[PDB]
């Protein structure tokens, strides 16, 4: 299967520089243009620029000509965006993305985006709490106080879905900060565990808070 | 530079009906156009290229027309699923560049939030902070005022809002609201209560617990 | 596609001196690669071809090195008319990829801007329309700031401002501005000025006329 | 009196650029090179250039070459030195100088120094607290917490009050600077008497003056 | 770079006695050699310049020898107030290039510190921190030991620690130590403990309250 897999998140001081890495699988690697795309917190998508593996043709955008520099590593698979002399307007989320038509269909494949932040303040690893208290029962998961972005949050390692609401993270005061609450029949909290699954990326971090009731 | 620009930062229709988004080239691009389609916390997905051919996967609700200059991403039978921004695109000239983007809303009758609240867990308190939550689930407009009072008095600082966005199953809205205290402060009083203004009600809905 | 990379987009040097602008490849061309010279509303002109041999008529000055990927062009003896855009291109593989090309920029004292304003003329004036233009010439550095006023009063819409390159002659630059406005609106007033701020300037230089 | 006046502290953030200014008066402003030295924290000193006011000519250690940039503005009689690019390793205190041999002594003029900070960080003003005791001496005190970036002066009775005091260098913690003073005085002084320990914070442009009060 | 050594960095002597530098230069700097003095906190001072002539206002005490790459400062009747660093520099060629510096210090008898401790002010208390300060004044020789103890548990965290130089007026050093708690975490304890080990007595200095 064809897969662009990309790291979470990249925490970078003003002034040094960072490079972004999209390693290609299940595909030929030098078959295909490599696209780049920037997305401000918040903002529209801008286009960084392309480079097709098989002999590093690359094709910039004026805007990124000196921050961005596209290559590749064919031993890998692996296509590479460095970003240097950064600044705040460089925190972003880079994706790396193809397009491939077979003759049959047009098929778009997209990585998960890099996180890219500028900032002097450390990694801090999230404080995960949780929210304990009729037919159903509301419980919730307080993500509190980590840098930088992303969290993502999950209920029973995704077996929990429906009736789940993840509230996007507010910076205040230097650190992110979200929640998450989760409606289930009162059959089945407290009766069977409930667990709120936390992982940041930026810290290696992977907790898995239990909704005792207590 | 060519400049595509969206017409409209929002659109809306009600589930069922029809949407659609125009976007404006600056020079002529001819048919060279793509469309994407963006869900909140995920990669852009590519829905239409060549103006009017959609990718595979792409349903035929989603089609595009236009060629020159003024070009329309229409989206039929429109679901809560496919709440999310759209984007035009043109590649016919370099540098690529992007529209702004349409964020689709939809319309649908009034909806009263589901209000609960949490006091700060043992956990937290060991920490020396303490947190309040109140969440408020499935409302709708997303129009809400949200106050935190202590024994009675008003707390407006110290408070973490966030919304999400419409919800992808039921068009709804919610709300979680966190009062943060230093664990001194949390034990220096007793009654906690978080009241929401909504339209669905003239009077406050009051979720409230004494630490007592 | 073969990718020829001019890392540098402008070179600083005065005249005399020698300057160096460099070329990488992103495969091994050997040295199929040429450089060409590009002055402004110019055609280009072939100035180097392999790598290191000179088209007839290119003066000694102008010489190229280089084998497998990185190239170099070298310059010596700058002159004031050298001021162009220099670009490399490899002919080793198909398609032929230019580079991005590198303008050649002079370094030189400092001058102040002649300053000289114009009204409307008669001919125009029978055409409905009415320009004031400001000449700003022989200056240096490039960055320079021009205010129209209009009864002591100042006017921004309706402004159209030129630059042009350096010289080729004394490496100065030199701007145009042109406040453009209806004949009547020409006539409802009478005292036109355009105010140059430059480096130079200890106080803005003032050019007036009075309807 | 022959004086250069220098400003206390420049707060810079990374990859921006600062001037530096150097006012001279009381002589005649183009009869001197004026040289500049940096000094980071806990080091030894260095040479950045000098130049001559007169006609701008300059010498520069190639160590600061595409990093300062001297000129002067002979109108004000005030000589400049701009620093590019500026980086962790720029945050230093930053002196003009002249010598002057009037041709009976040489003396030498140095400027008070420019504290330049490249830091993220934003300003924070200090939070000067009292120190008073719960002897033919008593000893009282001043703690200065809390503030970004440096520095800070600290006198006692606007400088009346000098024997006896120990200024204590400051403290970087938590991203903040922390320092105390203390000034030993006879019994028959305090609490009869005034004490007041005087704070200046130029990066915040803070002036504050706390009374040593017996509770 | 010319290279000026200063193969001491640090000097030591007594209250009216004598000391002397050296600094080696890399080459020969014929005598444009320069002696500065800086005191903590000031701009540094020319003492010397041209190997042996002092600035004026310079004391006879301050003498500078040397030609060639052997250049000496020696200060003779040593007092509390030449406490300083000392830099040589050499200004015979470009770029101009100082020694690592020398600081004076100062050896006399051993003095007990003057412990004097300080709770929380009432106005740092609605603030919502607590500091508590501990002054240990004129001791000698400047090693010592400070403990904090809360209700009979020592504290090792949040404590600021702080040295003087040596005292300008009778060579002594002097400490600050803060410790700074939560007003809470303040409000739940009652006794505050500081105590002082210095060489002068295996018996520490303790300083308490009760709040
Ligand atoms: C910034 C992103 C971007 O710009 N892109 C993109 C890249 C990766 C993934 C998604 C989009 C464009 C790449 C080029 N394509 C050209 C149109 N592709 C075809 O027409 C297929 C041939 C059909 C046929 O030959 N039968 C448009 C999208
Ligand atoms: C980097 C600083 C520096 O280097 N300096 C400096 C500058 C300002 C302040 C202090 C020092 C000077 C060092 C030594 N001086 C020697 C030249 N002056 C004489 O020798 C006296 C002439 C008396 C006579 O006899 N005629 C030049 C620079």
């Known amino acids: 299967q064809v897969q662009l897999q990309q790291p979470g998140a990249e925490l970078v001081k003003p002034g040094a520089s960072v490079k972004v890495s999209c390693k290609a699988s299940?595909?030929?690697?030098?078959?295909?243009?490599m696209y780049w795309v920037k997305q401000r917190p918040g903002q529209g998508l801008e286009w960084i620029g392309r480079?097709?593996?098989?002999?590093?043709?690359?094709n910039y955008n004026q805007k990124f000509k000196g921050k961005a520099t596209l290559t590749v590593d064919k031993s890998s698979s692996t296509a590479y965006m460095q970003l240097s002399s950064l600044t705040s307007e460089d925190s972003a989320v880079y994706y790396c993305?193809?397009?491939?038509?077979?003759?049959?269909?047009?098929?778009?494949?997209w990585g998960q985006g890099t996180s890219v932040t500028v900032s002097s303040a450390k990694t801090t690893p999230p404080s995960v709490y949780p929210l304990a208290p009729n037919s159903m029962v509301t419980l919730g998961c307080l993500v509190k106080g980590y840098f930088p972005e992303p969290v993502t949050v999950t209920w029973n390692s995704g077996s929990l879905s429906s009736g789940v609401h993840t509230f996007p993270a507010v910076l205040q005061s230097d650190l992110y900060t979200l929640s998450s609450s989760v409606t289930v029949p009162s059959s089945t909290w407290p009766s069977q565990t409930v667990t709120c699954n936390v992982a940041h990326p930026a810290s290696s971090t992977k907790v898995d808070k239990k909704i005792v009731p207590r | 530079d060519i400049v595509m620009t969206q017409s409209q930062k929002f659109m809306s229709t009600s589930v069922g009906d029809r949407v659609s988004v125009t976007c404006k080239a600056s020079?002529?691009?001819?048919?060279?156009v793509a469309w994407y389609q963006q869900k909140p916390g995920q990669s852009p997905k590519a829905l239409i290229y060549?103006?009017?051919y959609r990718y595979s996967g792409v349903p035929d609700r989603f089609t595009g027309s236009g060629s020159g200059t003024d070009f329309t991403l229409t989206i039929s039978n429109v679901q809560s699923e496919d709440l999310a921004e759209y984007f035009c695109?043109?590649?016919?000239?370099?540098?690529?560049?992007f529209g702004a983007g349409t964020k689709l809303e939809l319309k649908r009758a009034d909806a009263a939030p589901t209000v609960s609240i949490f006091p700060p867990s043992s956990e937290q308190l060991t920490s020396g902070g303490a947190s309040v939550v109140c969440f408020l689930n499935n409302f709708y407009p997303k129009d809400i005022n949200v106050k935190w009072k202590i024994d009675g008095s008003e707390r407006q600082n110290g408070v973490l809002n966030s919304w999400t966005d419409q919800d992808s199953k039921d068009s709804t809205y919610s709300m979680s609201s966190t009062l943060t205290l230093t664990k001194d402060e949390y034990e220096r009083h007793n009654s906690y209560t978080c009241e929401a203004t909504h339209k669905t009600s003239t009077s406050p809905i009051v979720k409230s617990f004494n630490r007592n | 596609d073969i990718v020829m990379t001019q890392s540098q987009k402008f070179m600083s040097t005065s005249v005399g001196d020698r300057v160096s602008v460099t070329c990488?490849?992103?495969?091994?061309?050997?040295?199929?690669?040429?450089?060409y010279q590009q002055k402004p509303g110019q055609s280009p002109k072939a100035?180097?071809?392999?790598?290191?041999?000179?088209?007839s008529g290119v003066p000694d000055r102008f010489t190229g090195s280089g084998s497998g990927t990185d190239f170099t062009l070298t310059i010596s003896n700058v002159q004031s008319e050298d001021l162009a855009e220099?670009?490399?291109?490899?002919?080793?593989?198909?398609?032929?990829?230019?580079?991005?090309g590198t303008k050649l920029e002079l370094k030189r004292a400092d001058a102040a801007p002649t300053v000289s304003i114009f009204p409307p003329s008669s001919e125009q004036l029978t055409s409905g329309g009415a320009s004031v233009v400001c000449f700003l010439n022989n200056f240096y550095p490039k960055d320079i700031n021009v205010k129209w006023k209009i009864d002591g009063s100042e006017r921004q819409n309706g402004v159209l401002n030129s630059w042009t390159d350096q010289d080729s002659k004394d490496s100065t630059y030199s701007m145009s501005s042109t406040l453009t406005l209806t004949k009547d609106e020409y006539e409802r007033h009478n005292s036109y000025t355009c105010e140059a701020t430059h480096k130079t300037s200890t106080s803005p230089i003032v050019k007036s006329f009075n309807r | 009196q022959v004086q250069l006046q220098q400003p206390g502290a420049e707060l810079v953030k990374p990859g921006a650029s600062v001037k530096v200014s150097c006012?001279?008066?009381?002589?005649?402003?183009?009869?001197?090179?004026?040289?500049?030295v940096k000094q980071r924290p806990g080091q030894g000193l260095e040479w950045?250039?000098?130049?001559?006011?007169?006609?701008?000519?300059?010498?520069?250690?190639q160590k600061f070459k595409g990093k300062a940039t001297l000129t002067v503005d002979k109108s004000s009689s005030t000589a400049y030195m701009q620093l590019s690019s500026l980086t962790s390793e720029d945050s230093a205190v930053?002196?003009?100088?002249?010598?002057?041999?009037?041709?009976?002594?040489?003396?030498?003029?140095?400027?008070?120094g420019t504290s330049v900070t490249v830091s993220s960080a934003k300003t924070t003003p200090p939070s000067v607290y009292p120190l008073a005791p719960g002897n033919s001496m008593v000893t009282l005190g001043c703690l200065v917490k809390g503030y970004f970036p440096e520095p800070v002066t600290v006198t006692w009775n606007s400088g009346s009050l000098s024997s006896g005091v120990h200024t204590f260098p400051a403290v970087l913690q938590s991203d903040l600077y922390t320092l105390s003073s203390s000034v030993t005085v006879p019994s028959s002084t305090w609490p009869s008497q005034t004490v007041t320990c005087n704070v200046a914070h130029p990066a915040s442009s803070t002036k504050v003056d706390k009374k040593i009060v017996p509770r | 770079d010319i290279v000026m050594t200063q193969s001491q960095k640090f000097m030591s002597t007594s209250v009216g006695d004598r000391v002397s530098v050296t600094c080696?230069?890399?080459?020969?700097?014929?005598?444009?050699?320069?002696?500065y003095q800086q005191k903590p906190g000031q701009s540094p001072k020319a003492?010397?310049?041209?190997?042996?002539?002092?600035?004026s206002g310079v004391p006879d005490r301050f003498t500078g020898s040397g030609s060639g790459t052997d250049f000496t400062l020696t200060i003779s009747n040593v007092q509390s107030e030449d406490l300083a660093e000392?830099?040589?520099?050499?200004?015979?060629?470009?770029?101009?290039?100082?020694?690592?510096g020398t600081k004076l210090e100062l050896k006399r008898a051993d003095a007990a510190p003057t412990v004097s401790i300080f709770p929380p002010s009432s106005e740092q208390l609605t603030s919502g921190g607590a500091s508590v300060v501990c002054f240990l004044n004129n001791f000698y020789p400047k090693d010592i030991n400070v403990k904090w103890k809360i209700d009979g548990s020592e504290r090792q965290n949040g404590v600021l620690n702080s040295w003087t130089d040596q005292d300008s007026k009778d060579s002594t050093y002097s400490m600050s130590s803060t410790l700074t708690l939560t007003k809470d975490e303040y409000e739940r304890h009652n006794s505050y403990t500081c105590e002082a080990t210095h060489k002068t007595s295996t018996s520490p200095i303790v300083k308490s309250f009760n709040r």
């Open positions: 480079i097709h593996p098989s002999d590093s043709d690359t």
């Open positions: 020079q002529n691009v001819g048919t060279n």
């Open positions: 993305a193809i397009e491939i038509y077979d003759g049959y269909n047009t098929m778009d494949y």
């Open positions: 299940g595909y030929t690697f030098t078959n295909y243009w």
């Open positions: 695109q043109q590649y016919n000239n370099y540098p690529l560049t």
């Open positions: 060549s103006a009017s």
